[PDB]
Design an enzyme around this catalytic site. Sequence first.
Site, short mmCIF file in Angstrom:
data_model
loop_
_atom_site.label_atom_id
_atom_site.label_comp_id
_atom_site.label_asym_id
_atom_site.label_seq_id
_atom_site.Cartn_x
_atom_site.Cartn_y
_atom_site.Cartn_z
N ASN B 186 0.81 -1.23 0.00
CA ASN B 186 0.00 0.00 0.00
C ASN B 186 0.85 1.29 0.00
O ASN B 186 0.30 2.37 0.23
CB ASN B 186 -0.96 0.01 1.19
CG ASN B 186 -1.86 -1.20 1.25
OD1 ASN B 186 -2.01 -1.84 2.30
ND2 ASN B 186 -2.48 -1.54 0.13
N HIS B 188 3.07 2.25 2.17
CA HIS B 188 3.36 2.73 3.51
C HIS B 188 4.66 2.05 3.96
O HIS B 188 4.96 0.94 3.52
CB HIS B 188 2.23 2.32 4.48
CG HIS B 188 0.97 3.10 4.29
ND1 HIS B 188 0.71 4.24 5.03
CD2 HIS B 188 -0.03 2.92 3.40
CE1 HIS B 188 -0.44 4.71 4.58
NE2 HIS B 188 -0.93 3.95 3.60
N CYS B 223 6.18 7.05 9.45
CA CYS B 223 7.20 7.78 8.73
C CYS B 223 6.70 7.70 7.27
O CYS B 223 6.34 6.62 6.79
CB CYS B 223 8.58 7.13 8.89
SG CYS B 223 9.82 7.66 7.68
#
Lengths: 265, 264
Positions: B186, B188, B223
Amino acid sequence: GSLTEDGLSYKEKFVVRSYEVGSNKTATVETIANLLQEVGCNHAQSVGFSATTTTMRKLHLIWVTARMHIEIYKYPAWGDVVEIETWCQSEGRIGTRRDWILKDSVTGEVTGRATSKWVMMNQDTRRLQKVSDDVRDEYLVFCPQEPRLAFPEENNRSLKKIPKLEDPAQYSMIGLKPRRADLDMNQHVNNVTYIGWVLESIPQEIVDTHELQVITLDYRRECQQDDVVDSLTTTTSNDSQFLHLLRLSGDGQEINRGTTLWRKK
Amino acid sequence: GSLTEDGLSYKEKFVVRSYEVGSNKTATVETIANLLQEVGCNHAQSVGFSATTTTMRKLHLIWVTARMHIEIYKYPAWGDVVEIETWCQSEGRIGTRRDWILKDSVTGEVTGRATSKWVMMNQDTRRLQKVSDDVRDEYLVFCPQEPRLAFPEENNRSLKKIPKLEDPAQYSMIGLKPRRADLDMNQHVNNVTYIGWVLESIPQEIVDTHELQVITLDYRRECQQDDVVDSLTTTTSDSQFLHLLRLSGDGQEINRGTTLWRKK
Ligand SMILES: Fc1cccnc1N[C@H]1CCCOCC1
Ligand SMILES: Fc1cccnc1N[C@H]1CCCOCC1
């Protein structure tokens, strides 16, 4: 995994993991490269290595990658089973070559292929050398004697000369550093990390709209654990081609050079 | 891999790979964390989550890790087969918990254990929320009803409060950035990358003479792909360390944690 019937090649099946895939839910080129390395290591182990021969350990010599070439037709999806066959061949006194064939386990179709050139080097001085008859005779019993090439074609991309990228680079990714996960069991930077670093300077829009079809990488010098790398890319081209250069952040010492070919999705 | 007989837990075997091991030829803590994540994903798939349920997808809600706790007695060697069993449990309105047990496939002995806390969050606004009874009932049929804890012991390490490291840090590793291999499907940053970043500020001499026995990590904020992280460590002691991951610029906290190391 297991050696084939004749004992001159090795096969292994892998189920693609959740963390091994990118945005398209298919294996990244770095996962493919890691699987090629794993099947290579399992082949060396199955034929008696622990792939340094008896004479090589005595003389403090190791095999080091000089070039890697990968072509992917289809990246396997998350949960798919990929079958990889690998084998080695002597290239006389120049060094050795390891080739791979990737197949979809369900259909049996070739989904990818790879070839690599390895050179002999003294582990301590880093000095390259030719392959002696003593070493050659020790690994020839594990290789097919007639040629067996993953890239047979007369004018194929695996043996093309790669030029040095000229400053200014079109794109760049600065200050790349290896972390402990990037190191192998001998505390050296894993060869697959360099593939990742080369790819970091490709813009995200190209990655989002294209698939990587071919990557050729030359390995000139290794990046130490405390070194910092700059990744540089320039477009050279329905297909996009790029020229790549990895160099040490400070003095600008070349570590790798390469080319990539991408096709539109 | 497969669900157990009662269908309330999942097991899978893994053969430790050449690139998955460190200098002692045994799996790194990041390889272990990756295997825990893989068996977790395979469990969710086996029970119909092709782990967001029907109601969560309509309301744009996801499960996010709030805390990870891992204890390793023996790291498996390169070529060894490790068996991992995983299961989930509701923790009422607070969220959910996923536990793991690692065993040596040949001896059958427990070589490690892990526990994680997950909270419900709207994926767009990133706003945390409690678990509704509509969602609770949809995942309770996949969980053991009586408690089953990987860390049963009263007053155990997995539930300890972690303090915020005070400047100046004893050790640090600055300017850490994720590359594409650090991202999940995704886009991330994968949760395992944060474990790696925490460990980067531990000196190489400690890593060379000690084995990591326990790691507890709190996840405060993600992050982003274009963010830069500083990793900070202070000895609090066996050797114990206090850890802090923060954004390189504004100093915004992303994680805090503790590690316990045993002399080899
Ligand atoms: F077969 C191997 C054994 C040990 C190390 N690397 C091997 N192969 C290649 C992996 C893929 C990226 O290119 C570098 C080399
Ligand atoms: F089960 C999981 C599914 C998807 C993602 N992570 C999972 N588990 C843990 C992985 C290792 C450490 O980070 C905490 C979460």
